[PDB]
Paper text:
Particles then were classified according to whether they had Coulomb potential at the center of the particle. A-particles showed density, but empty particles did not. The WT A- and E-particles were resolved to a resolution of 8.0 and 14 Å, respectively. Even at this relatively low resolution, the A-particle matches previously described structures (EMDB ID: 5465), with a cross-correlation score of 0.918. The A-particle capsid proteins expand outward, the virion RNA genome becomes reorganized, the N-terminus of capsid protein [name] is exposed on the surface of the particle, and VP4 is lost.
In this study, we genetically perturb this equilibrium in a non-enveloped virus, [name] to determine its structural basis. We isolate a single-point mutation variant with increased particle thermotolerance and decreased efficiency of cell entry.
Author numbering:
A (entry chain C), B (entry chain C): 60 to 174, 177 to 223
C (entry chain A): 129 to 296
D (entry chain A): 72 to 296
E (entry chain B), F (entry chain B): 7 to 37, 40 to 235
Write the structure that this text describes.
Amino acid sequence: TNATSLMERLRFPVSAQAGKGELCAVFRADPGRSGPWQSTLLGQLCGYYTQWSGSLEVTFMFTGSFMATGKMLIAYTPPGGPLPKDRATAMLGTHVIWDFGLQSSVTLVIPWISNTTGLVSIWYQTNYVVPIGAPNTAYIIALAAAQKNFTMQLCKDASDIL
Amino acid sequence: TNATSLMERLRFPVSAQAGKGELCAVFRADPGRSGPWQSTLLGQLCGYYTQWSGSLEVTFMFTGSFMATGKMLIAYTPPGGPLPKDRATAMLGTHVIWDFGLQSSVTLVIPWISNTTGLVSIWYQTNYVVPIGAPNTAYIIALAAAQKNFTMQLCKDASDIL
Amino acid sequence: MRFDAEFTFVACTPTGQVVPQLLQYMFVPPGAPKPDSRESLAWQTATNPSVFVKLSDPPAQVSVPFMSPASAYQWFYDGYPTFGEHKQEKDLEYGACPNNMMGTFSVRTVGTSKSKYPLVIRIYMRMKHVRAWIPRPMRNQNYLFKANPNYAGNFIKPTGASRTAITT
Amino acid sequence: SHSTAETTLDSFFSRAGLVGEIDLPLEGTTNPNGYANWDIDITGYAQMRRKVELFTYMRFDAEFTFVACTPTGQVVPQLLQYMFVPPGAPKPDSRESLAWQTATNPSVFVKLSDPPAQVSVPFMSPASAYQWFYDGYPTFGEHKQEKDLEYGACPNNMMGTFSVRTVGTSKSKYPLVIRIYMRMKHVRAWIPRPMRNQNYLFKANPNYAGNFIKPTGASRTAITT
Amino acid sequence: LTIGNSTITTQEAANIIVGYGEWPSYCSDSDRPDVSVNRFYTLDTKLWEKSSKGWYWKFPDVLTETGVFGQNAQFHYLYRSGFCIHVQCNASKFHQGALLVAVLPEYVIGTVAGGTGTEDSHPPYKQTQPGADGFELQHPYVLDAGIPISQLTVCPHQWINLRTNNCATIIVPYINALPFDSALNHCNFGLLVVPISPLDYDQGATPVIPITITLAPMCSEFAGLRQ
Amino acid sequence: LTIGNSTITTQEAANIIVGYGEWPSYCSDSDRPDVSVNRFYTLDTKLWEKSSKGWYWKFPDVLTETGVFGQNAQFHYLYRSGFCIHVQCNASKFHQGALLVAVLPEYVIGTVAGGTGTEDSHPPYKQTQPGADGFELQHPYVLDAGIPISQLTVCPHQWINLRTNNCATIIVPYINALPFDSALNHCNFGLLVVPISPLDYDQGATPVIPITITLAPMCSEFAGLRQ
């Protein structure tokens, strides 16, 4: 919350010092509840509303060094399955291969989300290693959008301000 | 009304000890009035209503021993005729033969009932007798329904609860 | 079943005399929480639609749409009412679950000072559309609790008019 | 989608809420002259301006109804008639102004026992449509280095006000309580812009203070689950 | 398709080369679940170090504990499916290396006779199921199999050249001795990897190289029987 | 077809009666494993006694622990299949009885308020999963559901008459409130049985009557999804 740390908020750093740990823990996907979704436009739009349903998509692009080699994998756990204790429980769910030769054409789609639901977790697929004369830190950019199948049913007389 | 006699309520027993007596005495057929009809769905439906008319049917199936022989007869006295003092007064009314080879295909229909009316009585047509090595008691199951010709005319502002 | 509602409000005295008093009614969507204290922001919300009518006019006819997020109301539920992913603990707001009802109304008096007359109001209820699918039996014995159909140890019998079944 | 009949846009915009409140003190110090003028200032309140600020190009007519009562809800037989002065003419300052004698201004009178009043006024602003934002200098004069004598008070942007008087030889002896509801009739927007997230400090300026705020801090730490 | 944050795949324009024109197919001579098998899960990441010599795994012994369908298949000995293996090495312009990858059928395990007395004891219970830990090599001429490394060329093999490309895929056919044979009793095959270039780099480069193992059944099965 | 010494079936000339011409079918509107599902296993035998009042089970709660596919389906909430229920009573010429069998959807469970103080505590953890033991009835008017027994006729029902036949089969359709709904969160239905004739017999007869429950999916499913 410091004043002189304002610009670094927009990303999250990643370093090679950490080994096979845990990158980010996305909270339960709910625009109505608190979390990352309150900043989005749809979550504010839902502030007068109750029931929502639709599809979710995520896009990732890789911004590493020109000589580096490795493999990244992003998977979403389907509903029913609890939080992944092991990578074996993660592999049974839908997973997409992320090569470093293809940047952003990878598309993952969650068929249906309503309001209970599944969870998404991100682990270190493998440690990013570089030889001498290369930076020891990188950054990752993420994307999130919704499909055409978003609809609204019931209006609510609720105002979140103030 | 005892607690530990709850399950036996749903039937009525019959025994060979009684000889040519009287099985059951059905009260005047009136869903509005008290009696067996208050438990039925139509009688509750009539609680906001006054005038009803329709047809009545009764079905009986025989559940005796495999070796027993005998004849049962169920008859409904038509209107005008009083309660049957003798079986001769019962025979002049409509009667149906109930063989033990046919179980439930027997159908009796009362043409028209309104709101005064006739009466129905059930006597022991003959005593149920069995040889040694057979149970001395049996049970009888009865059925009652209405035809398509049931109609309603006048609504009433009456509530039976409480 | 799913249907809209129509209500009219009448106020009078126990002697039947009429008085010239005007009220306007404001509705809060069920999604927004209901006010608890007078200093809540629910009274200042302008986004909530309102309709004002007088008393000398013909009786008021108002209709509200079905705003519940579900498809239709459910009177019975063979399970656990909460629709959360947690299935072993209990919510902090247990007991008070306004997520199932359809909200409430707020009443205030127009004028600088508070009103000095109490009123008597009666409400009538009706259905507009009738559509049913699964028929179930009704209740025969009385109710002991308001939200639970539980019974006591003093059993009852539908009727005992017949003194004895053996005789006529 | 499959069926879009229930998803009609009608419920997406239509919402009536309390916007204004006008008091008529029988004596006072803020208003000791016994009369007040209320210009239609949408920007006055933050809560309503949040909905409006998503819109940039709009022109529409207005519909208002007036209700008066007591804090106990009792009704009284009092009649009022409302007179409107075009925005072009200046608003009255003192009681001896000529604005009360102007017969050329149309007026409509309705009672209270009748069904609620429905009145509409046309768009009389000389411009094409209202503009909430203006990346420049608001004055439309050939002078671009000095400032007008009437700086600060510029009624050339609003839509005027209403005058209220009491019928009778003597002044009224009862104060009234009045609430106003506001709505839009036509909805048409062109250029979409973001809304506001932090609070407002001044009424006519979006300036902020040195105490910055954060949208949320619910997560105790991002490292853990 | 994958529940999580990893749906990495290997493009759509791969270069599959057939071998001797005997590409795997369906044997349906005489002498429905298809929804949950087509989804692939990504195995956990592993850190490669300088002192690593290699690893080996027994198939399908690893999948008995990992896969969801692995647990209930412990009492159902039948299994028949082909696999597609993709290998890729994420490296920048300051790394050198070469990789040799091959499949060795019936990878027999030979014991060792060390010490003053040539007598060996029974393997312990803990080492019977090493899991992800695996084993450590002692004599890498034989790779715990008695086979000189240079002569493995008799089996299908591929050379990983970093000059032009980085990712390569090899396809192998399923082989069995009988038309119907037990899978939990007879070992199918194994994987072998040998490091050719020792890890050399200057300061400032990435000292860790990810190791990627990708499993994807290129030939779908019906299965379902008592065996 | 069954591994063991029991492959009992209910003939091949059964008399299926449709209800209102809405026999179950496939809903495939827009608004492969088929080998291991067609095999039926016979549940263990149970001994009926004189004092038995009846039993009830929650579906598909019983199959979570019994079936092989039950265990791995605990995290996969989806399930959709119709069932065919066959009831038969093996009796000789010296036994009397009648059976009433029906299905009651949303079998709600009501608590009891006994003692001088009408206050009930939370159910214990052990009774949450009774398994094959089940529960015992206390007030059989309500059958732990508040419903008079005589009025259950509103739901589909059948009368077991021993005069002519002995084995009967009833078919019920699958019903749901939403096109896609969770199965592990919403109870599907339950089974109810009530004894009509108390067990009466003379000396020398068999004092024990077997109770047979037969499960067989008459409508096959594809299934396979994330729900």
